[PDB]
PDB file of C-alpha atoms and ligand atoms in Angstrom:
ATOM      1  CA  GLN W   3      39.262  33.694   5.740  1.00  0.00           C
ATOM      2  CA  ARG W   4      35.641  34.855   6.734  1.00  0.00           C
ATOM      3  CA  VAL W   5      32.425  33.355   5.269  1.00  0.00           C
ATOM      4  CA  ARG W   6      32.090  36.834   3.633  1.00  0.00           C
ATOM      5  CA  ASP W   7      35.348  36.227   1.631  1.00  0.00           C
ATOM      6  CA  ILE W   8      34.184  33.076  -0.110  1.00  0.00           C
ATOM      7  CA  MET W   9      30.434  33.574  -0.498  1.00  0.00           C
ATOM      8  CA  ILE W  10      28.467  34.022  -3.683  1.00  0.00           C
ATOM      9  CA  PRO W  11      27.168  37.528  -3.288  1.00  0.00           C
ATOM     10  CA  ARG W  12      23.518  38.378  -3.044  1.00  0.00           C
ATOM     11  CA  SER W  13      23.094  39.681  -6.618  1.00  0.00           C
ATOM     12  CA  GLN W  14      24.642  36.519  -8.135  1.00  0.00           C
ATOM     13  CA  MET W  15      22.437  34.111  -6.130  1.00  0.00           C
ATOM     14  CA  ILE W  16      20.136  32.137  -8.392  1.00  0.00           C
ATOM     15  CA  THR W  17      16.771  32.138  -6.567  1.00  0.00           C
ATOM     16  CA  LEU W  18      13.224  31.097  -6.942  1.00  0.00           C
ATOM     17  CA  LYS W  19      10.051  33.086  -6.028  1.00  0.00           C
ATOM     18  CA  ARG W  20       7.608  31.531  -3.627  1.00  0.00           C
ATOM     19  CA  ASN W  21       4.817  32.267  -6.096  1.00  0.00           C
ATOM     20  CA  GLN W  22       6.280  31.128  -9.542  1.00  0.00           C
ATOM     21  CA  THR W  23       4.697  28.180 -11.451  1.00  0.00           C
ATOM     22  CA  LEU W  24       6.561  24.874 -11.690  1.00  0.00           C
ATOM     23  CA  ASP W  25       7.365  25.698 -15.351  1.00  0.00           C
ATOM     24  CA  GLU W  26       8.928  28.990 -14.376  1.00  0.00           C
ATOM     25  CA  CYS W  27      10.811  27.300 -11.594  1.00  0.00           C
ATOM     26  CA  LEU W  28      12.155  24.459 -13.721  1.00  0.00           C
ATOM     27  CA  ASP W  29      13.277  26.968 -16.328  1.00  0.00           C
ATOM     28  CA  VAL W  30      15.552  28.588 -13.711  1.00  0.00           C
ATOM     29  CA  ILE W  31      16.594  25.369 -12.181  1.00  0.00           C
ATOM     30  CA  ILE W  32      17.482  23.515 -15.392  1.00  0.00           C
ATOM     31  CA  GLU W  33      19.268  26.322 -16.990  1.00  0.00           C
ATOM     32  CA  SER W  34      21.337  27.392 -13.873  1.00  0.00           C
ATOM     33  CA  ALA W  35      22.178  23.667 -13.185  1.00  0.00           C
ATOM     34  CA  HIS W  36      22.506  24.344  -9.440  1.00  0.00           C
ATOM     35  CA  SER W  37      21.176  21.887  -6.867  1.00  0.00           C
ATOM     36  CA  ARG W  38      19.627  24.211  -4.185  1.00  0.00           C
ATOM     37  CA  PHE W  39      18.066  27.570  -4.468  1.00  0.00           C
ATOM     38  CA  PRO W  40      17.103  30.160  -1.977  1.00  0.00           C
ATOM     39  CA  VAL W  41      13.361  30.898  -2.319  1.00  0.00           C
ATOM     40  CA  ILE W  42      12.525  34.606  -1.842  1.00  0.00           C
ATOM     41  CA  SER W  43       9.373  36.702  -1.380  1.00  0.00           C
ATOM     42  CA  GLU W  44       9.791  40.310  -2.515  1.00  0.00           C
ATOM     43  CA  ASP W  45      13.480  40.484  -3.121  1.00  0.00           C
ATOM     44  CA  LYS W  46      16.763  38.745  -2.370  1.00  0.00           C
ATOM     45  CA  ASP W  47      16.876  40.292   1.096  1.00  0.00           C
ATOM     46  CA  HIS W  48      13.930  38.215   2.270  1.00  0.00           C
ATOM     47  CA  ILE W  49      14.648  34.460   2.016  1.00  0.00           C
ATOM     48  CA  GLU W  50      11.710  32.225   2.892  1.00  0.00           C
ATOM     49  CA  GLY W  51      13.597  28.994   2.764  1.00  0.00           C
ATOM     50  CA  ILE W  52      15.619  26.659   0.421  1.00  0.00           C
ATOM     51  CA  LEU W  53      14.389  24.535  -2.487  1.00  0.00           C
ATOM     52  CA  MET W  54      16.529  21.454  -3.289  1.00  0.00           C
ATOM     53  CA  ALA W  55      16.040  20.270  -6.805  1.00  0.00           C
ATOM     54  CA  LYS W  56      15.992  16.545  -5.916  1.00  0.00           C
ATOM     55  CA  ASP W  57      12.825  17.202  -3.905  1.00  0.00           C
ATOM     56  CA  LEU W  58      11.033  17.832  -7.129  1.00  0.00           C
ATOM     57  CA  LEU W  59      11.574  14.209  -8.383  1.00  0.00           C
ATOM     58  CA  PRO W  60       8.679  12.582  -6.415  1.00  0.00           C
ATOM     59  CA  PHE W  61       6.333  14.946  -8.234  1.00  0.00           C
ATOM     60  CA  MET W  62       7.345  13.485 -11.410  1.00  0.00           C
ATOM     61  CA  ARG W  63       5.816  10.154 -10.532  1.00  0.00           C
ATOM     62  CA  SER W  64       2.730   9.236 -12.579  1.00  0.00           C
ATOM     63  CA  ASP W  65       0.602   8.901  -9.303  1.00  0.00           C
ATOM     64  CA  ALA W  66       2.259  11.783  -7.409  1.00  0.00           C
ATOM     65  CA  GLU W  67       0.528  14.473  -5.375  1.00  0.00           C
ATOM     66  CA  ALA W  68       0.263  17.944  -6.873  1.00  0.00           C
ATOM     67  CA  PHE W  69       3.410  20.122  -6.579  1.00  0.00           C
ATOM     68  CA  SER W  70       3.355  23.169  -4.397  1.00  0.00           C
ATOM     69  CA  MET W  71       6.180  25.170  -3.032  1.00  0.00           C
ATOM     70  CA  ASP W  72       5.028  24.470   0.465  1.00  0.00           C
ATOM     71  CA  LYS W  73       5.564  20.768  -0.048  1.00  0.00           C
ATOM     72  CA  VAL W  74       9.240  21.157  -0.701  1.00  0.00           C
ATOM     73  CA  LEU W  75      10.366  24.332   1.054  1.00  0.00           C
ATOM     74  CA  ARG W  76      13.100  23.756   3.735  1.00  0.00           C
ATOM     75  CA  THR W  77      14.296  26.002   6.471  1.00  0.00           C
ATOM     76  CA  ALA W  78      17.142  28.167   5.464  1.00  0.00           C
ATOM     77  CA  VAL W  79      20.191  28.220   7.796  1.00  0.00           C
ATOM     78  CA  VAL W  80      21.619  31.722   8.342  1.00  0.00           C
ATOM     79  CA  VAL W  81      25.036  32.608   9.513  1.00  0.00           C
ATOM     80  CA  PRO W  82      26.830  36.000  10.148  1.00  0.00           C
ATOM     81  CA  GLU W  83      29.345  37.439   7.631  1.00  0.00           C
ATOM     82  CA  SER W  84      32.068  37.244  10.285  1.00  0.00           C
ATOM     83  CA  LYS W  85      31.685  33.444  10.808  1.00  0.00           C
ATOM     84  CA  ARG W  86      34.941  31.496  10.280  1.00  0.00           C
ATOM     85  CA  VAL W  87      35.373  29.257   7.372  1.00  0.00           C
ATOM     86  CA  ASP W  88      36.794  26.524   9.732  1.00  0.00           C
ATOM     87  CA  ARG W  89      33.694  26.744  11.868  1.00  0.00           C
ATOM     88  CA  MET W  90      31.477  27.060   8.828  1.00  0.00           C
ATOM     89  CA  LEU W  91      33.037  23.856   7.386  1.00  0.00           C
ATOM     90  CA  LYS W  92      32.600  22.041  10.777  1.00  0.00           C
ATOM     91  CA  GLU W  93      28.951  23.070  10.928  1.00  0.00           C
ATOM     92  CA  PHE W  94      28.202  21.904   7.321  1.00  0.00           C
ATOM     93  CA  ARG W  95      29.824  18.672   8.294  1.00  0.00           C
ATOM     94  CA  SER W  96      28.153  17.933  11.687  1.00  0.00           C
ATOM     95  CA  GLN W  97      24.648  19.126  10.714  1.00  0.00           C
ATOM     96  CA  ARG W  98      24.876  17.334   7.344  1.00  0.00           C
ATOM     97  CA  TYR W  99      23.948  20.348   5.110  1.00  0.00           C
ATOM     98  CA  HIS W 100      25.413  22.101   2.096  1.00  0.00           C
ATOM     99  CA  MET W 101      24.203  25.679   1.803  1.00  0.00           C
ATOM    100  CA  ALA W 102      23.902  28.601   4.288  1.00  0.00           C
ATOM    101  CA  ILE W 103      22.599  32.129   3.803  1.00  0.00           C
ATOM    102  CA  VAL W 104      25.003  34.886   5.026  1.00  0.00           C
ATOM    103  CA  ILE W 105      23.481  37.879   6.758  1.00  0.00           C
ATOM    104  CA  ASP W 106      25.015  41.209   7.435  1.00  0.00           C
ATOM    105  CA  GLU W 107      25.058  42.957  10.868  1.00  0.00           C
ATOM    106  CA  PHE W 108      21.789  44.693   9.835  1.00  0.00           C
ATOM    107  CA  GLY W 109      19.665  41.707   8.841  1.00  0.00           C
ATOM    108  CA  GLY W 110      20.241  42.239   5.064  1.00  0.00           C
ATOM    109  CA  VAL W 111      21.273  39.195   3.030  1.00  0.00           C
ATOM    110  CA  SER W 112      24.962  39.290   1.894  1.00  0.00           C
ATOM    111  CA  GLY W 113      25.120  36.080  -0.093  1.00  0.00           C
ATOM    112  CA  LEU W 114      25.143  32.335   0.291  1.00  0.00           C
ATOM    113  CA  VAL W 115      27.985  29.936   1.112  1.00  0.00           C
ATOM    114  CA  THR W 116      28.287  26.307   0.256  1.00  0.00           C
ATOM    115  CA  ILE W 117      30.396  23.436   1.416  1.00  0.00           C
ATOM    116  CA  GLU W 118      31.401  22.928  -2.178  1.00  0.00           C
ATOM    117  CA  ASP W 119      33.167  26.157  -2.360  1.00  0.00           C
ATOM    118  CA  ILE W 120      34.921  25.669   1.022  1.00  0.00           C
ATOM    119  CA  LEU W 121      36.388  22.144  -0.223  1.00  0.00           C
ATOM    120  CA  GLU W 122      37.462  23.600  -3.493  1.00  0.00           C
ATOM    121  CA  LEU W 123      39.691  25.925  -1.384  1.00  0.00           C
ATOM    122  CA  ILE W 124      41.394  23.245   0.661  1.00  0.00           C
TER     123      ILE W 124
ATOM    124  CA  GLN J   3      45.653   4.760  -0.071  1.00  0.00           C
ATOM    125  CA  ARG J   4      44.132   3.283  -3.223  1.00  0.00           C
ATOM    126  CA  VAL J   5      40.703   3.559  -4.889  1.00  0.00           C
ATOM    127  CA  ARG J   6      39.987  -0.057  -3.731  1.00  0.00           C
ATOM    128  CA  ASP J   7      40.108   1.341  -0.164  1.00  0.00           C
ATOM    129  CA  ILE J   8      37.391   3.970  -0.688  1.00  0.00           C
ATOM    130  CA  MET J   9      35.202   2.668  -3.418  1.00  0.00           C
ATOM    131  CA  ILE J  10      31.640   1.589  -3.010  1.00  0.00           C
ATOM    132  CA  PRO J  11      31.774  -2.209  -3.890  1.00  0.00           C
ATOM    133  CA  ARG J  12      29.873  -3.554  -6.965  1.00  0.00           C
ATOM    134  CA  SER J  13      27.283  -5.398  -4.738  1.00  0.00           C
ATOM    135  CA  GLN J  14      26.367  -2.152  -2.999  1.00  0.00           C
ATOM    136  CA  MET J  15      26.135   0.035  -6.224  1.00  0.00           C
ATOM    137  CA  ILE J  16      22.671   1.469  -6.819  1.00  0.00           C
ATOM    138  CA  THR J  17      22.211   1.286 -10.548  1.00  0.00           C
ATOM    139  CA  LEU J  18      19.524   1.807 -13.132  1.00  0.00           C
ATOM    140  CA  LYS J  19      18.755  -0.370 -16.239  1.00  0.00           C
ATOM    141  CA  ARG J  20      19.114   1.068 -19.719  1.00  0.00           C
ATOM    142  CA  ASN J  21      15.570  -0.064 -20.724  1.00  0.00           C
ATOM    143  CA  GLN J  22      13.724   1.214 -17.532  1.00  0.00           C
ATOM    144  CA  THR J  23      10.754   3.371 -17.648  1.00  0.00           C
ATOM    145  CA  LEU J  24      10.752   6.852 -16.063  1.00  0.00           C
ATOM    146  CA  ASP J  25       8.670   5.710 -13.066  1.00  0.00           C
ATOM    147  CA  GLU J  26      10.884   2.784 -12.439  1.00  0.00           C
ATOM    148  CA  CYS J  27      14.014   5.058 -12.486  1.00  0.00           C
ATOM    149  CA  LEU J  28      12.213   7.481 -10.242  1.00  0.00           C
ATOM    150  CA  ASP J  29      11.396   4.882  -7.633  1.00  0.00           C
ATOM    151  CA  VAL J  30      15.130   3.819  -7.416  1.00  0.00           C
ATOM    152  CA  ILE J  31      16.454   7.385  -7.415  1.00  0.00           C
ATOM    153  CA  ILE J  32      13.934   8.602  -4.761  1.00  0.00           C
ATOM    154  CA  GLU J  33      14.459   5.532  -2.408  1.00  0.00           C
ATOM    155  CA  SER J  34      18.283   5.826  -2.626  1.00  0.00           C
ATOM    156  CA  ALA J  35      18.542   9.582  -2.562  1.00  0.00           C
ATOM    157  CA  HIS J  36      21.802   9.551  -4.623  1.00  0.00           C
ATOM    158  CA  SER J  37      22.631  12.084  -7.417  1.00  0.00           C
ATOM    159  CA  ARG J  38      24.289   9.861  -9.955  1.00  0.00           C
ATOM    160  CA  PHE J  39      23.736   6.200 -10.994  1.00  0.00           C
ATOM    161  CA  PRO J  40      25.612   3.886 -13.098  1.00  0.00           C
ATOM    162  CA  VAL J  41      23.358   2.664 -16.027  1.00  0.00           C
ATOM    163  CA  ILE J  42      23.609  -1.023 -16.867  1.00  0.00           C
ATOM    164  CA  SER J  43      22.508  -3.301 -19.660  1.00  0.00           C
ATOM    165  CA  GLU J  44      22.913  -7.026 -18.889  1.00  0.00           C
ATOM    166  CA  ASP J  45      24.170  -6.683 -15.296  1.00  0.00           C
ATOM    167  CA  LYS J  46      26.579  -4.583 -13.246  1.00  0.00           C
ATOM    168  CA  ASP J  47      29.666  -5.614 -15.306  1.00  0.00           C
ATOM    169  CA  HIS J  48      28.038  -4.028 -18.256  1.00  0.00           C
ATOM    170  CA  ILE J  49      27.962  -0.337 -17.505  1.00  0.00           C
ATOM    171  CA  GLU J  50      26.599   1.808 -20.368  1.00  0.00           C
ATOM    172  CA  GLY J  51      26.965   5.158 -18.861  1.00  0.00           C
ATOM    173  CA  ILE J  52      26.029   7.347 -15.841  1.00  0.00           C
ATOM    174  CA  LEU J  53      22.808   9.162 -15.301  1.00  0.00           C
ATOM    175  CA  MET J  54      22.496  12.239 -13.089  1.00  0.00           C
ATOM    176  CA  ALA J  55      19.105  12.590 -11.398  1.00  0.00           C
ATOM    177  CA  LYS J  56      19.003  16.342 -12.180  1.00  0.00           C
ATOM    178  CA  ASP J  57      19.068  15.644 -15.888  1.00  0.00           C
ATOM    179  CA  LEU J  58      15.579  14.241 -15.581  1.00  0.00           C
ATOM    180  CA  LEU J  59      14.089  17.615 -14.625  1.00  0.00           C
ATOM    181  CA  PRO J  60      13.473  18.827 -18.194  1.00  0.00           C
ATOM    182  CA  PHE J  61      10.958  15.979 -18.577  1.00  0.00           C
ATOM    183  CA  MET J  62       8.746  17.520 -15.772  1.00  0.00           C
ATOM    184  CA  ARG J  63       8.222  20.740 -17.904  1.00  0.00           C
ATOM    185  CA  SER J  64       4.664  20.976 -19.284  1.00  0.00           C
ATOM    186  CA  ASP J  65       5.645  20.961 -22.979  1.00  0.00           C
ATOM    187  CA  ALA J  66       8.434  18.295 -22.746  1.00  0.00           C
ATOM    188  CA  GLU J  67       9.078  15.422 -25.109  1.00  0.00           C
ATOM    189  CA  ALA J  68       8.812  11.930 -23.705  1.00  0.00           C
ATOM    190  CA  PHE J  69      11.724  10.621 -21.531  1.00  0.00           C
ATOM    191  CA  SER J  70      14.284   8.369 -23.042  1.00  0.00           C
ATOM    192  CA  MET J  71      17.564   7.160 -21.522  1.00  0.00           C
ATOM    193  CA  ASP J  72      19.493   7.956 -24.748  1.00  0.00           C
ATOM    194  CA  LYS J  73      19.178  11.723 -24.282  1.00  0.00           C
ATOM    195  CA  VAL J  74      20.457  11.925 -20.701  1.00  0.00           C
ATOM    196  CA  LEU J  75      22.993   9.145 -20.420  1.00  0.00           C
ATOM    197  CA  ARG J  76      26.604  10.306 -20.201  1.00  0.00           C
ATOM    198  CA  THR J  77      29.869   8.162 -20.951  1.00  0.00           C
ATOM    199  CA  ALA J  78      31.252   6.309 -17.905  1.00  0.00           C
ATOM    200  CA  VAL J  79      34.922   6.731 -17.001  1.00  0.00           C
ATOM    201  CA  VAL J  80      36.650   3.537 -15.863  1.00  0.00           C
ATOM    202  CA  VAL J  81      39.637   3.358 -13.424  1.00  0.00           C
ATOM    203  CA  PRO J  82      41.704   0.457 -11.862  1.00  0.00           C
ATOM    204  CA  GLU J  83      41.213  -0.251  -8.114  1.00  0.00           C
ATOM    205  CA  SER J  84      45.067   0.090  -7.570  1.00  0.00           C
ATOM    206  CA  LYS J  85      44.992   3.775  -8.686  1.00  0.00           C
ATOM    207  CA  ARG J  86      46.208   6.107  -5.842  1.00  0.00           C
ATOM    208  CA  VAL J  87      43.568   8.339  -4.319  1.00  0.00           C
ATOM    209  CA  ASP J  88      45.720  11.472  -4.923  1.00  0.00           C
ATOM    210  CA  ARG J  89      45.831  10.768  -8.619  1.00  0.00           C
ATOM    211  CA  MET J  90      42.160   9.976  -8.605  1.00  0.00           C
ATOM    212  CA  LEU J  91      41.455  13.377  -7.063  1.00  0.00           C
ATOM    213  CA  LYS J  92      43.535  15.133  -9.797  1.00  0.00           C
ATOM    214  CA  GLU J  93      41.817  13.258 -12.650  1.00  0.00           C
ATOM    215  CA  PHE J  94      38.288  14.099 -11.269  1.00  0.00           C
ATOM    216  CA  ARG J  95      39.219  17.775 -11.159  1.00  0.00           C
ATOM    217  CA  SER J  96      41.087  17.742 -14.498  1.00  0.00           C
ATOM    218  CA  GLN J  97      38.363  15.857 -16.457  1.00  0.00           C
ATOM    219  CA  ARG J  98      35.618  17.671 -14.467  1.00  0.00           C
ATOM    220  CA  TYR J  99      33.612  14.568 -13.282  1.00  0.00           C
ATOM    221  CA  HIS J 100      32.236  13.203 -10.090  1.00  0.00           C
ATOM    222  CA  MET J 101      31.991   9.401 -10.350  1.00  0.00           C
ATOM    223  CA  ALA J 102      34.083   6.679 -11.905  1.00  0.00           C
ATOM    224  CA  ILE J 103      33.592   2.971 -12.454  1.00  0.00           C
ATOM    225  CA  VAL J 104      36.302   0.876 -10.788  1.00  0.00           C
ATOM    226  CA  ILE J 105      37.648  -2.414 -12.294  1.00  0.00           C
ATOM    227  CA  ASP J 106      39.928  -5.120 -11.033  1.00  0.00           C
ATOM    228  CA  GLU J 107      42.773  -6.863 -12.985  1.00  0.00           C
ATOM    229  CA  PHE J 108      40.405  -9.194 -14.822  1.00  0.00           C
ATOM    230  CA  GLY J 109      38.507  -6.259 -16.260  1.00  0.00           C
ATOM    231  CA  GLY J 110      35.359  -7.002 -14.021  1.00  0.00           C
ATOM    232  CA  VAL J 111      33.574  -4.143 -12.450  1.00  0.00           C
ATOM    233  CA  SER J 112      34.598  -4.032  -8.710  1.00  0.00           C
ATOM    234  CA  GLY J 113      32.779  -0.747  -7.642  1.00  0.00           C
ATOM    235  CA  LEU J 114      32.335   2.905  -8.064  1.00  0.00           C
ATOM    236  CA  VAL J 115      34.211   5.852  -6.590  1.00  0.00           C
ATOM    237  CA  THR J 116      33.295   9.490  -6.053  1.00  0.00           C
ATOM    238  CA  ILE J 117      34.968  12.714  -5.433  1.00  0.00           C
ATOM    239  CA  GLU J 118      32.737  13.403  -2.475  1.00  0.00           C
ATOM    240  CA  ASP J 119      34.260  10.228  -0.746  1.00  0.00           C
ATOM    241  CA  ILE J 120      37.809  11.437  -1.476  1.00  0.00           C
ATOM    242  CA  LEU J 121      37.094  15.030  -0.123  1.00  0.00           C
ATOM    243  CA  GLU J 122      35.334  13.642   2.788  1.00  0.00           C
ATOM    244  CA  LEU J 123      38.536  11.669   3.596  1.00  0.00           C
ATOM    245  CA  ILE J 124      40.627  14.883   3.528  1.00  0.00           C
ATOM    246  CA  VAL J 125      38.496  17.057   5.869  1.00  0.00           C
TER     247      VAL J 125
HETATM  248  N1  LIG C 201      21.494  28.929  -6.081  1.00  0.00           N
HETATM  249  C1  LIG C 201      22.810  29.302  -6.357  1.00  0.00           C
HETATM  250  N2  LIG C 201      23.055  30.616  -6.873  1.00  0.00           N
HETATM  251  C2  LIG C 201      24.316  30.932  -7.151  1.00  0.00           C
HETATM  252  N3  LIG C 201      25.424  30.101  -7.002  1.00  0.00           N
HETATM  253  C3  LIG C 201      25.139  28.897  -6.477  1.00  0.00           C
HETATM  254  C4  LIG C 201      23.853  28.425  -6.165  1.00  0.00           C
HETATM  255  N4  LIG C 201      24.000  27.115  -5.742  1.00  0.00           N
HETATM  256  C5  LIG C 201      25.213  26.809  -5.762  1.00  0.00           C
HETATM  257  N5  LIG C 201      25.969  27.826  -6.209  1.00  0.00           N
HETATM  258  C6  LIG C 201      27.411  27.937  -6.394  1.00  0.00           C
HETATM  259  O1  LIG C 201      27.713  27.074  -7.576  1.00  0.00           O
HETATM  260  C7  LIG C 201      28.668  26.123  -7.114  1.00  0.00           C
HETATM  261  C8  LIG C 201      28.275  24.759  -7.723  1.00  0.00           C
HETATM  262  O2  LIG C 201      27.325  24.205  -6.810  1.00  0.00           O
HETATM  263  P1  LIG C 201      26.188  23.411  -7.539  1.00  0.00           P
HETATM  264  O3  LIG C 201      25.786  24.278  -8.615  1.00  0.00           O
HETATM  265  O4  LIG C 201      25.113  23.075  -6.525  1.00  0.00           O
HETATM  266  O5  LIG C 201      26.948  22.271  -8.031  1.00  0.00           O
HETATM  267  C9  LIG C 201      28.667  26.101  -5.659  1.00  0.00           C
HETATM  268  O6  LIG C 201      29.978  25.819  -5.072  1.00  0.00           O
HETATM  269  C10 LIG C 201      28.183  27.418  -5.255  1.00  0.00           C
HETATM  270  O7  LIG C 201      29.289  28.177  -5.117  1.00  0.00           O
HETATM  271  N1  LIG C 202      24.704   5.201  -7.318  1.00  0.00           N
HETATM  272  C1  LIG C 202      25.303   4.929  -6.121  1.00  0.00           C
HETATM  273  N2  LIG C 202      25.374   3.734  -5.512  1.00  0.00           N
HETATM  274  C2  LIG C 202      25.880   3.468  -4.268  1.00  0.00           C
HETATM  275  N3  LIG C 202      26.461   4.468  -3.568  1.00  0.00           N
HETATM  276  C3  LIG C 202      26.392   5.766  -4.096  1.00  0.00           C
HETATM  277  C4  LIG C 202      25.863   6.019  -5.359  1.00  0.00           C
HETATM  278  N4  LIG C 202      25.981   7.386  -5.641  1.00  0.00           N
HETATM  279  C5  LIG C 202      26.639   7.838  -4.499  1.00  0.00           C
HETATM  280  N5  LIG C 202      26.868   6.827  -3.607  1.00  0.00           N
HETATM  281  C6  LIG C 202      27.586   6.940  -2.337  1.00  0.00           C
HETATM  282  O1  LIG C 202      26.863   7.756  -1.421  1.00  0.00           O
HETATM  283  C7  LIG C 202      27.676   8.972  -1.329  1.00  0.00           C
HETATM  284  C8  LIG C 202      26.833  10.236  -1.360  1.00  0.00           C
HETATM  285  O2  LIG C 202      26.615  10.799  -2.702  1.00  0.00           O
HETATM  286  P1  LIG C 202      25.128  11.261  -3.047  1.00  0.00           P
HETATM  287  O3  LIG C 202      24.270  10.252  -2.277  1.00  0.00           O
HETATM  288  O4  LIG C 202      24.895  11.212  -4.570  1.00  0.00           O
HETATM  289  O5  LIG C 202      25.107  12.625  -2.465  1.00  0.00           O
HETATM  290  C9  LIG C 202      28.622   8.991  -2.453  1.00  0.00           C
HETATM  291  O6  LIG C 202      29.824   9.731  -2.138  1.00  0.00           O
HETATM  292  C10 LIG C 202      28.950   7.509  -2.566  1.00  0.00           C
HETATM  293  O7  LIG C 202      29.780   7.152  -1.578  1.00  0.00           O
END
């Protein structure tokens, strides 16, 4: 199929805001139980990057630095809606990543796609 | 293909001790980068459960209670090394879990196996 046929659409993406407090973030993270979250600015069409929940663990150490979104924000990989699942799988595999943001022909965000959902198919 | 052929051997398992402090668990988790860890008592043949790193997050919240292994530890599922990988895949999916403890014919812990390693095999 197309990446578009297996993606989590935009409105169902569980995201974080680049300005929220750690507590507000944790609330979302803990209750959604997901591992990676797109981080947005004004809305879900403007993704600043990706936050992986495991990157929060160093901040839990008793002698850790202060947490800030900038310390954990990763670059978001974007792919077109028309990208092929085979190619999508191959790319998750060779670049060793798990989530990509799907963009429409017009620069809007269509949804996210994960290696987990592809494998569940096969 | 059997579990024995794809398991991570006991000697390479990254584990946590049931009586370890939060900092000590964090050091191990951070250094290894894994998501789940068998939790042991005396040694690696004495597996008490599995801990998922993400279950530690509620203790970072500002008004959280103090961390204790009791409230995050989950029961460990044990399988024999001769089990076929196809059956293992079906049990993981049926019982909705990601990591199992593998034992040999003497009942000793021989390793761990994960669904990610099985899926990786079938790509
Ligand atoms: N941030 C997210 N928002 C919405 N769905 C997601 C998110 N992260 C992962 N998923 C979906 O939830 C499934 C479980 O992934 P995870 O929750 O990371 O185990 C994945 O296969 C994705 O389809
Ligand atoms: N606690 C662990 N000890 C040793 N190897 C592990 C452990 N957890 C996972 N692995 C291995 O490393 C792979 C990646 O899983 P993870 O590192 O949790 O993403 C797993 O499929 C296992 O093969």
